[PDB]
Design a protein around this nucleic acid. Structure first.
Lengths: 287, 287, 287, 287, 279, 287
RNA sequence: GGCAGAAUGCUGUAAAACA
């Protein structure tokens, strides 16, 4: 199915251990790039979440952020290190003896690293819930991508309908275009004949006759819109395939615009460029 | 109707507690880029804000910054962890017995992590007003775009009037230059004392007239100014269509300059090219 | 007069509130692009500053940066969160009751986050001074543009005198076209020893004399240097008009080089192309 | 054998001293960059660890973390630095003389870095096992890379088979396209009432056919897929070479698309570009 | 002499204040375009630096970056903001009212941000030394252009020697060409007219083409020693070379002269390709 | 005399006070950054050490470790910045005048950054010997860098011999390729075409010869290996100069691949890019 | 108009680069 490369997904899980929030953002990119902002406590989950991301997403820069705020009140009571505190007090008394003046601060002893440390919580139980929330976030992310992808497909199918209409309007002027093609070649034949001892006369006519195929340019445009409809229903990653198709649309419209056949044909040729330009806008953020 | 691609809208809301400001900027771009700088608390508004913006704007580098200024005075009172504070004080008194000296600092106990924190935020109600301000800011942003859009349209229309005047001037000058060549050619024959063959002079003068015939270029230029006037009345965005029309304008001006032989016609062609360049400069800012 | 596109202006203002610095720098550009890097407190000045910049300037890549350095101490007494400071005192007092001993350091409460809110500034009287500094910086920027522009005008006029000198040299080293081809044909036909008709041969000499005659090309070169002098004295924007004029200068030099039949003319054509190239380089710096 | 730049490997050793864990993770990178998260006890092993990894590996970003968990008995209690403590007391007394007031806080002396530091064991025997454990991790790392690289090689081979199929399809379609295009071009001249020498016209038709013939491009594509198979069969460092081969693939496909006439050839060129893009995506993750 | 538009030059000036590294990098360009990445402290030097560079270079896209690494110890001695300290003391006194206890610590006031900030550096004598390094870097930059332009000059002179050899080879066949031109003139006359004959005589003969080629070679040799900006002048000379050789390429008499003309065209194309990257 | 950014130098100094070991290690970096592991006894030597190291080095991440083993016979003292220590006390006294209370903690003055600093003028007997040991260690570190960079120079020059081999290899294929194109073209015209019509065969071959003419790229490649040899003997910091040279190497190598019409040349141009990639990897280690 | 392709604009590349 058609998918977009700009989606936002968010999930949050709460419990006695605390609250953990998963956030996922996507921006357009040629390849798949994953950047993580995991907390230091759960730094060990990076390979697993990276594999989970790469297993479902196929293109676009992805930013994943995990915020973990433990419940301090629900945490176990802090335990006082009896031996470590006693060691510091005896050591601090020695410094008082050398300096002959001192005042032990009881809070400063408690603030020392190690002493008065809370018991470590069971991170293994939290990891499973966090991974479940990550899977839910991936599901929401894919749903958001698909929801916006349908909008892009509708916009592109709207533009492609206009391209066929513009081809029909240009085909309405074929009797005038065919008359113009003859005059382009007839004038060149006699213009070169007026010039004397001019070589490569046949080369000019042969090259010129190849570059006035207005009928063939419309056929290729009509063949691309038929194919572009088929590309949109491939159910695979067609983001890049459409990007290479837009270059073929650009190639045909560029040659048609430079013809300058007629005032009314020029308006349609300008419109073809506009439709392709608008169509190329949507292809940028398709996956 | 038409809109400028650069604008600036700022809206500030003074709620019961705190205040928020919505700021929008826009710069010229070939596609639509929407960059958001939302605060940490309201980071989840991006999908809602992005949808509400991409549905009203077509092109430009739109940057939206939401600045949240909480009222600490009106903020919820910090909750004091009585049990955690009591645990530290009793443990501090344990050190005091062994140290035999020292006084517990009341501020130091409060400075301990987890003793005091903001228990409640209640951001669901305050986020509704912020989103409501966004709809107001977009309306001002669109009006700012349309206000500057009219100046661009007026400038483009003035330059189009100048283009029509220059075309009329060239058309007026053309017959005199056509007659000037005939007098100069016969003068050289008279100066060379050579009697040209019958119908050779008439045949030769046809080639020069074809060389200096710019009627088709002027007709195409008038058709292009009429088409540009029609385009400027369209409700859809016309930045790309006008930018493509300027290419046809440039083609006609280049052909006129190339086929020019008189100083006055060359000066008029240069004036046409200057007018087209000014038109394109104004077009770059059109939606 | 004419103004260079690249310039640099800087202006610093001091006061009891602090220091502010305006820096404006521009470089060559096809159109007018203005990028503003304003401080956070003064982001609301962007529309006014942009309007003034666009009013004063025609084209360039102008970038304006405002550096704001508020004084740390201002507005008399420091702004204190009275509720938060009082709230911590009550909480600290409760800790004293349990421990029966303690003291509250005033700086400890001041160092508490939120108690010392960001110092309030008027931000309205300072805006007038900043806008006045912006106007002064615009005056300096325009003066610097005009000073550099006068040097560019001298360089262009020096090369224009070179073009007139080269045209004089060509008109003196150019032999009589009718006589030059007559002598060349006679010698070549002397080997053939057969002449179809002397009467018809003389007619073709005059008709095809203009093919190799460069008198017409030289007159247009002399007409353009007179026009280029006139363009340099206009009050409007001149860079675009002169840039399109150099195309006409190059058009004549190419035709003069191709039509050249003598080494002196060809060497002069190269010299003309060098002078035009040197003259075209300076025009790229004129707005 | 071909290897990948993304792999994982973990090794742990259990002993009476404690438990040490080695973790290696690789992410694709242009060059080799090594980051080490080593404990303070084994910080001196970084130059030894870095040399072993840089010698065995060639490319990719590698992050190696050594998780050292000593036993309670193996932990060394903090030892007071009496020599350093007495120096600070003398240093503090010098400042007291300048101020004539103040008292030295005994805890503040202890909190000074280096005064209260745990004794460091020899750990020479323990580190000897760590290096052997690290060498085991590196041995499994290469094996881990090789298994992952086999899938990439299989994918690249499948896409190369698709490329060969597309090339043979284009070669099958081409002669009919060439035959019809020549027939259409000569018929176009007849409709324009242009009479040309058959010998001269036929010579121009042959040269134009050589201009629009794509046999050489397909031959180059076949040679490129054969060389790609050889490169895959090569031994080491076939990432960047293979990427350059993909650049050549893209060049040939772009030439084929630009020189194409029929819609089928254009569709085949689009398919070739899609296959080359997928190969580039896979190859970006190859050492 | 000949200057190549691509070069690199680096100079580092070191001192008690820190370091300052100038890194000029240049590639090809039709005109002179300079881009600067200056540190925030020395961004005001752009007009002075830009003027200095524009006066010593003629073409190329120059990218000059100044890297400033100020020293921590180079900062001035601390000064006391008496206005800010007094405000903090009054602010501290307010808290003492509610608490009705406590003593303000003088050092804690000094530890507050902004009350003992160091004096700003002069940044005036430093800029004088930085501009001295820029002047030196340009001298190194020019040498890097000249040491690369000598190779291009040698290649162009080699191609010019090849062109002279080809011209001599063509001149060795002058009587054969002269006979061919007479037959061509008679053939058109005997076909029957005057319209075609007059322009045929107007066309440049082969000997004049070779003389113009030799004159172009001599002028190119002089230009390579002109000792100024000769990139565009050499490009125009190559255009003239192409215009002269097109006649020989078009004319067909025999295999040897055709091969010599093809060699001349290839040599002129190589010269033109190598000219594009000379300042 | 190329210096590499990876080196190691250890120097031990023995005296009556004990044994002091200076170790210096360097790792690749874009700029110069120094980290010190001085014991707190000699912590005040950090500014002088940093000044000397930044004076004698240009680029690279440098880690310096000093191990000090004092003896009971000799006792040292902490070097203090007397000028700054007295200034802080004077400033504190001024604050005491306004507050009319307070006391100065001696440890607070010492903890102030810059107070625990040393200068070369005021150094102990041991400190001067430590500084001399550091000078010797830095000289040995420079020697190690020079002798490690000699290996890098050999590695790079080995690749440069490959580049000249590829350049002379392509130069032999070029006369064969152009000659082979002649046979292929006349084979097509050998069917029923008399190629002796004007010079279409020769003009096409001339046009083809100018399209595939890679002589300009090969000469610039050869002129860049001559200059790269001289850069490797400049006896200065040429790490960045070589990096810019490789960009010029890749610029000509990639253009050679593009203009190539034969598979052998393209396979050679791929080899040129690989040699550049191998050289680029070593250049990252060059100071 | 960094180098180069096709014919203002679009691709390849330096760019897994430089801010």
């Amino acid at each position: 199915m058609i998918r977009s490369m700009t989606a936002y997904a968010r999930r949050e899980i709460k419990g006695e251990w605390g609250s953990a929030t998963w956030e996922m953002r996507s921006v357009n990119q040629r390849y798949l790039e994953t950047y993580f902002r995991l907390p230091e406590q759960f730094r060990s989950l990076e390979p697993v979440v990276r594999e989970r991301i790469r297993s479902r997403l196929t293109r676009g820069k992805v930013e994943c952020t995990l915020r973990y705020e433990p419940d301090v009140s629900a945490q176990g009571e802090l335990i006082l290190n009896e031996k470590l505190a006693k060691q510091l007090v005896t050591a601090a008394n020695w410094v008082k003896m050398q300096s002959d003046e001192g005042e032990i601060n009881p809070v400063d002893i408690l603030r020392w690293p190690g002493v008065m440390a809370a018991q470590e919580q069971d991170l293994d139980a939290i990891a499973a819930e966090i991974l479940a929330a990550l899977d839910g976030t991936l599901d929401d992310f894919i749903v958001a991508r698909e929801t916006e992808g349908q909008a892009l497909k509708a916009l592109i199918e709207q533009r492609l309908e206009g391209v066929t209409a513009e081809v029909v309007k240009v085909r309405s002027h074929m009797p005038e275009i065919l008359q113009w093609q003859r005059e382009r070649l007839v004038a060149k034949l006699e213009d070169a004949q007026v010039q004397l001892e001019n070589n490569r006369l046949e080369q000019e006519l042969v090259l010129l006759a190849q570059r006035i195929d207005v009928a063939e340019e419309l056929d290729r445009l009509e063949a691309h819109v038929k194919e572009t409809y088929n590309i949109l229903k491939k159910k695979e990653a067609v983001g890049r395939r459409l990007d290479f198709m837009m270059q073929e649309f650009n190639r045909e419209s560029n040659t048609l615009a430079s013809k300058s056949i007629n005032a009314e044909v020029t308006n349609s040729a300008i419109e073809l460029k506009v439709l392709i330009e608008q169509m190329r806008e949507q292809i940028q953020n398709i996956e």
